[PDB]
Every structure is written in structure tokens, then in C-alpha cells.
Design a protein around this motif. Structure first.
Motif, PDB file in Angstrom:
ATOM      1  N   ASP A 126      13.860  86.895 119.968  1.00 18.73           N
ATOM      2  CA  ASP A 126      14.335  86.470 121.181  1.00 18.73           C
ATOM      3  C   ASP A 126      13.783  85.216 121.620  1.00 18.73           C
ATOM      4  OD1 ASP A 126      14.835  86.223 123.985  1.00 18.73           O
ATOM      5  OD2 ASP A 126      14.879  88.566 124.113  1.00 18.73           O
ATOM      6  N   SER A 158      18.546  83.032 127.054  1.00 16.70           N
ATOM      7  CA  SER A 158      18.004  83.802 125.692  1.00 16.70           C
ATOM      8  C   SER A 158      19.148  83.405 124.455  1.00 16.70           C
ATOM      9  CB  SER A 158      17.673  85.155 125.908  1.00 16.70           C
ATOM     10  OG  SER A 158      17.641  85.947 125.127  1.00 16.70           O
ATOM     11  N   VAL A 159      18.502  83.290 123.351  1.00 20.68           N
ATOM     12  CA  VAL A 159      19.331  83.304 122.004  1.00 20.68           C
ATOM     13  C   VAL A 159      18.348  84.059 121.246  1.00 20.68           C
ATOM     14  CG1 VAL A 159      20.039  81.939 120.348  1.00 20.68           C
ATOM     15  CG2 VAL A 159      20.542  81.297 122.612  1.00 20.68           C
ATOM     16  N   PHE A 160      19.000  84.843 120.327  1.00 23.35           N
ATOM     17  CA  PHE A 160      18.702  85.744 119.320  1.00 23.35           C
ATOM     18  C   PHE A 160      18.652  84.940 118.004  1.00 23.35           C
ATOM     19  CE2 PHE A 160      18.354  89.484 116.535  1.00 23.35           C
ATOM     20  CZ  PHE A 160      16.850  90.081 116.880  1.00 23.35           C
ATOM     21  N   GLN A 192      14.587  93.346 113.337  1.00 18.91           N
ATOM     22  CA  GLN A 192      14.469  93.360 114.953  1.00 18.91           C
ATOM     23  C   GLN A 192      15.640  93.563 115.459  1.00 18.91           C
ATOM     24  OE1 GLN A 192      12.711  89.775 116.504  1.00 18.91           O
ATOM     25  NE2 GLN A 192      12.750  90.945 118.404  1.00 18.91           N
ATOM     26  N   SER A 214       9.569  86.974 119.806  1.00 17.70           N
ATOM     27  CA  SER A 214       9.778  86.823 121.186  1.00 17.70           C
ATOM     28  C   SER A 214       9.122  85.453 121.355  1.00 17.70           C
ATOM     29  CB  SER A 214       8.806  87.776 122.048  1.00 17.70           C
ATOM     30  OG  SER A 214       9.511  87.595 123.272  1.00 17.70           O
ATOM     31  N   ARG A 261      11.714  93.258 124.175  1.00 24.19           N
ATOM     32  CA  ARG A 261      11.630  92.334 122.896  1.00 24.19           C
ATOM     33  C   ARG A 261      10.959  92.820 121.624  1.00 24.19           C
ATOM     34  NH1 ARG A 261       9.632  88.805 127.434  1.00 24.19           N
ATOM     35  NH2 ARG A 261      11.190  87.439 128.234  1.00 24.19           N
ATOM     36  N   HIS A 308      13.550  82.276 124.238  1.00 20.47           N
ATOM     37  CA  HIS A 308      14.070  82.363 125.665  1.00 20.47           C
ATOM     38  C   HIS A 308      13.517  81.137 126.418  1.00 20.47           C
ATOM     39  CE1 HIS A 308      10.938  85.434 124.968  1.00 20.47           C
ATOM     40  NE2 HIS A 308      10.466  84.895 126.113  1.00 20.47           N
ATOM     41  N   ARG A 316      23.964  83.307 110.338  1.00 24.84           N
ATOM     42  CA  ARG A 316      24.400  84.198 111.206  1.00 24.84           C
ATOM     43  C   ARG A 316      25.621  84.771 110.940  1.00 24.84           C
ATOM     44  NH1 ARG A 316      22.702  84.619 116.779  1.00 24.84           N
ATOM     45  NH2 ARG A 316      21.338  82.702 116.317  1.00 24.84           N
ATOM     46  N   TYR A 368      12.380  80.740 130.370  1.00 25.75           N
ATOM     47  CA  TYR A 368      12.303  81.343 131.914  1.00 25.75           C
ATOM     48  C   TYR A 368      12.814  80.306 133.017  1.00 25.75           C
ATOM     49  CZ  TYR A 368       9.131  85.115 130.402  1.00 25.75           C
ATOM     50  OH  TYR A 368       8.831  86.390 129.730  1.00 25.75           O
ATOM     51  N   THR A 379      15.620  84.985 132.232  1.00 21.49           N
ATOM     52  CA  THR A 379      15.646  83.892 130.877  1.00 21.49           C
ATOM     53  C   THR A 379      17.172  83.712 130.861  1.00 21.49           C
ATOM     54  OG1 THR A 379      15.539  85.583 129.358  1.00 21.49           O
ATOM     55  CG2 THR A 379      13.578  84.842 130.178  1.00 21.49           C
ATOM     56  N   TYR A 433      18.333  93.225 119.145  1.00 24.24           N
ATOM     57  CA  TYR A 433      18.622  92.879 120.370  1.00 24.24           C
ATOM     58  C   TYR A 433      19.896  93.015 121.148  1.00 24.24           C
ATOM     59  CZ  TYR A 433      19.211  88.244 122.983  1.00 24.24           C
ATOM     60  OH  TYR A 433      19.537  87.256 123.846  1.00 24.24           O
TER      61      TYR A 433
END
Lengths: 279, 287
Positions: free
Chosen positions: B229, B32-34, A173, B191, A148, B231, A37, B233, B30, A175
Motif C-alpha cells: 500500500d 493510494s496505489v497497491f 498481501q 505499507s 494495510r 500512499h 501487474r 497523506y 490518503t 488490498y
């Protein structure tokens, strides 16, 4: 400190990688599946422990964005990295005897701007044919940041036999959260010594471009690898490189307000405070 | 040598602490971490999650359904697996503007992309024999004849076909890799519903890898699970908090009960999950 991931990955391959031959048979140390990262917040990840060919990075990306698939068009900008794959001899070895010199087939440029259109040659007009993935990505970022499915895909199984080389960068991708744009690259094959620093810089640059177009701030670049490898003749030089302490990452300045991704020119970009160790 | 399932649980922990609030198409929200990556060993163990029972029958039938090239929800529903039904219903298809489409016709989804990438999609019942790229068989073939190849990719993400699909694929692509007679697989999953999808997702591609390894005379290596993504919920936080309290039991084994020649020949009865010891199923909702 961002560069330490890259250096950590080199360290991991040296200790844990396995001996594995390639298309050439020259042989590598190899790990399958890695992830780093790199933060893009007020810093640009141009590696400092060995100088990266920045000019190459930027011209190649502008070349992609124009949709060109003509090695000669990039070569004219001083960047020779795709020339050998477009040479009469290399094209002939692939059975493309009728193809003009420089015609790489339906590679990045075509896939990003015309995915699924019928490829003829590098000079053909493809206007309004196929999927303009690059613009759909920009559009989706603007109108529905939570989406997404913000993906730009260079891997086209139908077109693979027509390409001079299959893409290393299968897809990326994007985000969005908290006004930050992040990007993740799926790179199927990584030359850790020669390719990867250049590769990290490309997609970091792409992210900076799209962030600028969309009024967002750069977030993270996430670098995912398939076959992460070090060539055996690179072990000794990389051992020297691992000894060097990274200098702080440069910044990237974008010198004017730019409206459409097609409008970016090389002179719009300035690398500030770049301090690499000698090659 | 710690239990594989701890990565999955670690990822849940990381999203709970560090994930950010992000809304979805439904607006339910959500954490969320990418960008995340876990590694699940496949050597004498199969990563069917134990802290919550995974719908194994679903996993296996869905995969056989993919392999046949079917894009017909009804064909999977007949096997007792309802997971794609709602996406094939008259109501759902109409909401996407597909009024002329037969009920069950999901468009050019996984089966079609794996077996006929780039062919012209007509409907779920059409014959696509010898049309488009058979990615699944080219992958098997490349593994057999050139294991060192760095291009062993099966790609479900087809930008031209996206507007015709009932849902765009969560699993954009997978890549295979061979060293020391071991087959590894990496999934790029754009996702991830961490609570409901991910355990099922991990099991699918682990199973796929076991299938191809068997066909190609190789041993299962690693499954590498990469997320976009990632995530959780919000209505799943409390149930997942209960799940995190559980200690994983050892992973089951997967036995393949006869010698199988071609990937199309696999039947459900060829597969046996041995020593699976899950904790009691946890209650979660949906999008």
C-alpha cells in the motif's frame, strides 16, 4: 494485454540477465527484483502462449486450504508435482528417516492454517493450534477492508529445517479499494519457463476465491520476484514461445454461491474460453 | 543515465495522478496505489534523497539498535533518536492493553525477530542468548558460503508475535542476492508513507546492504524497493507538490572508515556520508 508483461519479463532476462548457477549447478540467466501487474477484472490470467497445468493449479490450492502437508493426498487427485519431495529417498537425504513417505513437513498448508504451532507429522490434528492466517485474512477483509496488514506468510524461519523445500512464495498481501480485492505475491525465486505461469495462476485463483467469499470483485494480481531466472536449456524453447501472439485471456466462473473458503470444491470452478497454443 | 531519485519522484507523481482515495486507522485519508517497485543503484553512490533532507542520524542509530536486538525504545531515545518513543509511551502501551509492560517495551519487534525469530518473548530486558533463529547472522553466513542461494531472507513478519508488538512491521521481509561479487537487496514493504517514511526507509536498507557487503567482502549492487500500500497523506499533497519542483543533486557516497569483522562491531563513527547536498527540509505532519 496482460500476457505481454510475462513475455516482457522473459525478454528482459534474455537481454539483461546474468549467468548464475543454482543448487543443481545447471545454470540460469538471472535478474533480481521484478514486478508485473495482471488485471483480474472480467478476465483470468491463464497464460495462452503455452498451456498451463490448470488442474494442478486448482488441486494444489485446495490442498493448501485443507492444511494438508501430505504429498500423497495431492497425488491422489492426479497432481504429482510435490511427489519427489515426499519420496522415501528424498526424505532420507534430508535426515528424516523416521518420517512417513509423503510428509513434506510444515509447508504451505500448515503455515497458512497453523503458523507457529508445533509440527509433529502430516497426520497430526492441529485444530485450534497456531495462527489461522487464511481465515484472519478473510475476516480482516470483511470487517476492516482499509487495513494495510492483510498478510499471509509462508516463510517461517523456525520451521525451515523441517520442510522438504523452503517455500518459493514467501508471502502474499491483500488490498481493498472501491469494492476490488487485489493481491501481491512476494516470490523469492522464479523459474520463468516452468514455474511462473503456474505460480501466476495460483494466486490469481486464490484472489478469486477470497473475493467470492467476501463479496468483492477481483482487482489486480501483482507479481513480485526475487531471483527471476530462466534455465539455459529453456532459452531455445522460450525463443519459440516469444513468437506467438497471445489469445484473449479466459474467464473463470464460480458455479455456485460459497460461504466459507473450506467449502470450495474443484467442480465449483470453470475455465471458460481457454485457447492456448500447443505445448 | 538518469538520477536514481527520479524513481522516487516518479512514484509520487503516479500516486498524485492515479492513486485512489482510501482512509486509514486515523481516518485522515490518503491517495493510494497497491504494488510499486523502484531500483536504486548502490555502486559508488548512496541513495540518500536530496530533494528533502533525510534524518540520516535516525537511519543509522535505528539500524544499530536493530542489530543489537534491542526492542527498547528508551535505548534508541538515548542516542538522540525519538522516532519510536510514542509507540513505547505509557499511554500508547495502555491503549493496546499492555498495562503491565514497562515504558519503552515495544514487544517483539525488529531486533527480536532478526536475532531471535521464534523464541518466546518475555520482556525487553530478558536474555534471549541462543534462543530462536538468528536470521541476521544466518544471512551473513549464507552469503559467505553459498552466494548462489535463493533463500537469503530475513523476515520480520511473525504472525504468532503480531498481537504482542506495539506496531506490526512496515518491512515484512528483505531478500539478498549475489552475482559478480555484488550484493543486492530487495525489501518487501507492506505499507509506505511516501512523504515521511519512504526516504528514510530506502536509506535503512541501503545502509543494511552496505554493512553486509562490507562484512562479506562484496560490493554493493542494487537496492530494490517493493511496496504494498503505497500512499500519500492528504495533508502532504501541498508540501510534496513543492518538493516535486526540485531538481535532485547527485547522490552522496557512504564511506566505511575502518575494516569491520562482525556485524555487531559496527559503531556510528565507522560511517561517513560524503558530499550530501540536500535541499531545505520540508514541513509535513503525521498519522
Amino acid at each position: 494485454h496482460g500476457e505481454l508483461q510475462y513475455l516482457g519479463q522473459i525478454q528482459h532476462i534474455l537481454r539483461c540477465g546474468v549467468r548464475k548457477d543454482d543448487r543443481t549447478g545447471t545454470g540460469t540467466l538471472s535478474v533480481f527484483g521484478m514486478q508485473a501487474r495482471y488485471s483480474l477484472r472480467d478476465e483470468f490470467p491463464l497464460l495462452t502462449t503455452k498451456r498451463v497445468f490448470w488442474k494442478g493449479v486448482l488441486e494444489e490450492l485446495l490442498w493448501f486450504i485443507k492444511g494438508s502437508t501430505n504429498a500423497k493426498e495431492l497425488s491422489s487427485k492426479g497432481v504429482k508435482i510435490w511427489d519427489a519431495n515426499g519420496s522415501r529417498d528424498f526424505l532420507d537425504s534430508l535426515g528424516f528417516s523416521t518420517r512417513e513417505e509423503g510428509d513434506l513437513g510444515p509447508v504451505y498448508g500448515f503455515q497458512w492454517r497453523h503458523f507457529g504451532a508445533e509440527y509433529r507429522d502430516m497426520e497430526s490434528d492441529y485444530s485450534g493450534q497456531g495462527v489461522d492466517q487464511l481465515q484472519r485474512v478473510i475476516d480482516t477483509i470483511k470487517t476492516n477492508p482499509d487495513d494495510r496488514r492483510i498478510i499471509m506468510c509462508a516463510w517461517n524461519p523456525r520451521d525451515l529445517p523441517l520442510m522438504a523445500l523452503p517455500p518459493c512464495h514467501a508471502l502474499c498481501q491483500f488490498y481493498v479499494v472501491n469494492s476490488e480485492l487485489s493481491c501481491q505475491l512476494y516470490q523469492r525465486s522464479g523459474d520463468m519457463g516452468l514455474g511462473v505461469p503456474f505460480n501466476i495462476a495460483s494466486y490469481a485463483l486464490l484472489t478469486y476465491m477470497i473475493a467470492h467469499i467476501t463479496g468483492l470483485k477481483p482487482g489486480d494480481f501483482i507479481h513480485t520476484l526475487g531471483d527471476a531466472h530462466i534455465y539455459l536449456n529453456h532459452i531455445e524453447p522460450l525463443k519459440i514461445q516469444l513468437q506467438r501472439e497471445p489469445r484473449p485471456f479466459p474467464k473463470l466462473r464460480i458455479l455456485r454461491k460459497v460461504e466459507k473458503i473450506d467449502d470450495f470444491k474443484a467442480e465449483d470452478f470453470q475455465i471458460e474460453g481457454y485457447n492456448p497454443h500447443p505445448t
